[PDB]
């Protein structure tokens, strides 16, 4: 009856290494591989009450009393120096291919189907919407989160390393590419192919990824936040922590890859957002909401049981959006 | 000595044998489904109700450990401070139009999540006892986190016929939901021994599969799907 | 011609045809199961669909008939007052602990019911969502007043299985929920030619009787009977 | 009547060791031996559900409350530095004889047969073509399970250690020996000689078997995973904990063991799947599926009793299946 | 040590903000200046 594997577990691919902090001067760019490392420091913070009270801490005498006792913390900071105002972000990322091919299947005949299916389009259309959606998540500073909000400039140079080597280079202008459009450039065609070339299983793809960001002079740069243990005193609470890998700041890597997956711009919602992550059922966290409900059977899991068990091929929209997540992997299947 | 099968539970003992000590012993397993869980080592002397009440503590760990890892939503009917909870129901599915929310003067009740990021609706007191009666938890529903989405599914394309192991959770002996065979024979109309063929496996004689019809009835009955 | 069903009723013709005015003329005789309700003079010129609108009519007036008089009782939550009703509940049953009650300042909440010798206790906004979900009639509550107490019962050996007729009050055609067989078909999970043997009556063969757990569980879902 | 022994408890051959892994450069591979250690360090992961809903779940709200409440977690992740592109994962393997001897039994009848029966069987045909297909799994980098989809370049080096020093040294491209074919070359005929003396008694086998992929600059490699006690919060979860043993991840010598056994070409199913782990109903567990079925007349346990008990020799190919499972030993024998 | 624009006088953010969103009931110019002012400085409002 070709009912779906229990277990499909995939790999994912373009897996991006972790993204590694330093700190600098615009126009220093071009010798950047010496630059110090931004260092997670610590500083007190002193505050009041700014929270919204739940009509008992209301009363004027509770409130002062909770005033005249203020909470202390000490946080984690990333600030650049004061003569540095360049935030270089450094990460290697690797495009393997074979998405159609599961780690894990339980079903033969359903590992056939589903190989027949990808090889099926494929043949339609290759890895090229989604390599030049990918290719504009690489060359705007998307995984520069929050470093990228209140940059006056920011710079990408991504290098194919093919033996160690730089094959080709690519700069870009990541404020000029915007978080929004998906655009058509002849260099970001080039990096499509090539993005391509190693999703399909063409070549082997590796490129490094540095970006720059003219935030200022001293100012706060954002890395990834860690998970607090909350054991230690009230006073010395430490609320923040930031990630560092050795005595140098870092964003996660797969923060960067979330980033680098913000290409869906095909959910049934409207383009007021724009892109978001492709996620089984489109979930957004900053939104709190999900795109691609199973209700209005737009979610990954619906559309690749209508293409591969019934053969009800979707729009190639939908097809781009199931390869894509079939792309980023999971444990998908019933637990 | 043998397996002892105390609900989806099985007390399987070793072939072989060993004699600590001067008295002979038995390598005893559970496991829960094809996942073992506690083994000790029981001596052959221990009688079959030793080793189960021996191995009945791992046995209520699990229950309780179920339960709370299934326990369903709750919604509080607050007022328009928000501060103060008038109402909590047990949901078992969330309604379909909450929203980030929180209660505000204008509107007199408000239902919010039980979680942190509170989304909710503003509803009067009838539309409460609408959502409370079509949304209701079951007293039983954790058991529902231990079933599989194909056999708890209200469309019978995609339903799937429970096994062995998915009825032998909440039918008979020492199950989660304590009923015996003939109890839910009698809860589903018909005698004990045509429910015995739906409860022992093994060859495809005395094997007839439950209905779809008949398995959400009796889920119903047992207030473990559907029941609200 | 040849009789129209609708429903639980049957639009028979006399197999005599009259000539009133100069045109053939047929008696059409409606009936509810043994009971007719309008026998009226029609043409052998009329279709099937105007046959029926003839009748639609007191078809209509009976449906309303039959839903005031087995509506389910109202419950009325209200506040310590007793005049401003909070909410209302339509329920199958109502609760045991009911007595005749007035509300006072005592309790803020109070549960009576809308007859008018008002019988109520004091309740708490949990107490009334437990009792609300426990008690709750379906919304098609009204179609159980049109059936027989023995194939509505919930114990094993009191239960009778529905003929055609009391199948075809709920399952097709004309039915009062509205559904046809595929539909009723569908949320049993059986095939449409399995539920066609089910409400086809005639001879024995290519007729079955449904069991206690596919009956009670499509009035369940259909929303006629426990269904909360 | 040589009715079946009831223990037959048999002693692995091949053992390796834990495979280390460390951090370096290509073209440094000579000068491998000072490479710093791979460290387990810990991140933080915050995700939202991709998994399969029950139907139960599948109502919006609660897929929204799963996102306004995403699951925290930390994890173990094992990477290279961000100047360091080559893994290098290093391992011994004491190739040993005395194969159809079991270290355990219950009958001196059986004990005599099975050692008369691999007696003719290595007269007829000794260790010659487990050896070239152990040779091949040693050649290819098998034992880099995830460590090998995405490598650029992958080397494996194999040292004869012969009173401290080395004998003979193999130098094999592991990407091209594929995972697939067991071809012939010169370099893999005289390991399969040396591990056919190791087998056959003749003499004593030990190696040193380094391995070093291209995984790419800071890219994360993957040992082995521990189990998870899941003895704290849901937030301080620690999801995912990786196998090291003094601050240095290594992959665990079961693993290797099995990349080494994984010869058996002769199931029953299609070989053009790829071959298999010699294991008793030829099983593998991320397809779920049991090649060697106990109903088929082809399983180890079967073609054992064949062999043994009533003489019915089976084919050569089978014959070597039965013997590869003597060699990588077990707990045979009923209850 | 001491709160102006106390909840009970309803002159401070929250109530503010939530008279000028749901109720549509914009406050004085300087008071949609310090409502401003206080989405300008950010915080974690809402339920906490």
Same mark, same amino acid.
């Given at each position: 009856?070709?009912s779906?594997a229990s ?9 991006p ?9 615009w126009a220093q760019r071009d010798?950047?591989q010496?630059?110090?490392?931004? !260092?997670? =420091?610590?500083?007190?913070?002193? @505050? +009041?009450? #700014? ?6 801490? *209301? %009363? ?15 946080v ?5 120096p ?9 990460? !290697?990322? =690797?495009?393997?291919?074979?998405? @159609? +091919?599961? #780690? ?5 005949a359903? *590992? %056939? ?18 390599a ?12 520069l ?10 710079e ?23 978080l929004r ?10 990096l499509?192919?090539?993005?391509a ?5 063409s070549?082997?793809?590796?490129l490094?990824?540095?970006a ?9 740069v954002?890395?990834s ?8 005193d ?5 609320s923040?922590?930031?990630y ?7 964003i ?6 979330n ?9 049934p ?20 909401k ?6 209005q ?5 619906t559309?690749?049981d ?5 053969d ?5 929209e ?11 992997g ?6 | 000595?043998?397996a ?7 007390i399987?003992?070793?072939?072989r ?17 094809p996942?073992?869980?506690?083994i000790?080592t029981?001596?052959?002397?221990y ?9 009945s ?15 369903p939503?709750?919604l ?19 309604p379909?139009?909450?929203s ?19 989304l ?13 009666v ?9 058991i ?37 065979g003939?109890?839910?024979?009698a809860?589903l109309?018909?005698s ?12 495809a ?7 779809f ?16």
């Amino acid at each position: 009856i070709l009912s779906t594997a229990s277990v499909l577990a995939f790999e994912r691919k373009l897996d991006p290494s972790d993204a590694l902090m330093s700190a600098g001067a615009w126009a220093q760019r071009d010798a950047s591989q010496e630059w110090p490392a931004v !260092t997670v =420091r610590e500083k007190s913070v002193r @505050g +009041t009450i #700014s929270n919204r009270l739940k009509t008992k801490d *209301r %009363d004027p005498a509770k409130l002062d009393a909770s005033i005249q006792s203020p909470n202390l913390q000490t946080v984690d900071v990333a600030n650049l120096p004061s003569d540095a105002d360049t935030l270089k972000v450094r990460f !290697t990322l =690797r495009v393997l291919g074979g998405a @159609g +091919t599961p #780690s894990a299947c339980n079903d033969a005949a359903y *590992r %056939d189907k589903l190989l027949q299916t990808v090889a099926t389009y494929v043949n339609d259309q290759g890895f090229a919407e989604l390599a030049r959606r990918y290719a504009h998540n690489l060359a705007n500073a998307r995984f520069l989160w929050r470093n990228r909000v209140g940059a006056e400039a920011v710079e990408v140079r991504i290098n194919h390393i093919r033996q160690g080597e730089v094959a080709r280079a690519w700069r870009f202008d990541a404020l000029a590419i915007g978080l929004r459009d998906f655009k058509a450039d002849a260099e970001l065609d080039a990096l499509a192919e090539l993005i391509a070339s190693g999703l399909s299983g063409s070549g082997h793809v590796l490129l490094e990824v540095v970006a720059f960001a003219r935030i200022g002079d001293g100012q706060e740069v954002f890395p990834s936040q860690e998970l607090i243990l909350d054991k230690g005193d009230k006073k010395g609470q430490k609320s923040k922590t930031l990630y560092s890998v050795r005595d140098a700041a870092a964003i996660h890597s797969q923060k960067i890859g979330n980033a680098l997956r913000t290409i869906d711009t095909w959910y049934p919602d409207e383009d007021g957002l724009g892109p978001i992550a492709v996620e089984p059922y489109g979930s957004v966290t900053s939104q709190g909401k999900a795109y691609r409900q199973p209700k209005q059977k737009l979610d990954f899991y619906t559309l690749l049981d209508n293409w591969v068990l019934r053969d009800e091929a979707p729009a190639v929209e939908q097809q781009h959006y199931v390869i894509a997540n079939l792309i980023r992997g999971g444990v998908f299947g019933e637990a | 000595m043998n397996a002892i099968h105390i609900g989806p539970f099985s007390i399987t003992p070793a072939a072989r044998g060993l004699h600590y000590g001067g008295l002979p012993h038995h390598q005893w397993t559970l496991y829960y489904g094809p996942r073992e869980m506690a083994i000790k080592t029981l001596p052959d002397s221990y009688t079959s109700s030793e080793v189960r009440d021996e191995f009945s503590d791992i046995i209520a760990e699990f229950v309780i450990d179920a339960r709370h890892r299934y326990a369903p939503d709750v919604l509080e009917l607050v007022n328009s401070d928000g501060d103060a909870v008038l109402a909590r129901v047990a949901v078992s599915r969330l309604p379909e139009a909450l929203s980030g929310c929180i209660p505000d003067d204008r509107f007199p009740y408000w239902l919010l999540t039980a979680s942190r990021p509170r989304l909710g609706l503003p509803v009067t007191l009838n539309e409460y006892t609408a959502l409370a009666v079509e949304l209701s938890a079951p007293p039983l529903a954790w058991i529902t986190g231990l079933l599989p989405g194909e056999v708890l599914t209200h469309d019978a394309e995609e339903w799937r016929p429970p096994t062995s192991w998915e009825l032998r959770h909440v039918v008979g002996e020492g199950s989660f939901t304590g009923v015996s065979g003939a109890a839910a024979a009698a809860l589903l109309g018909m005698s004990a021994t045509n429910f015995r063929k739906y409860t022992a496996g093994d060859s495809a004689a005395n094997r007839q599969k439950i209905s779809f019809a008949a398995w959400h009835y009796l889920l119903d009955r047992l207030g473990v799907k559907r029941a609200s």
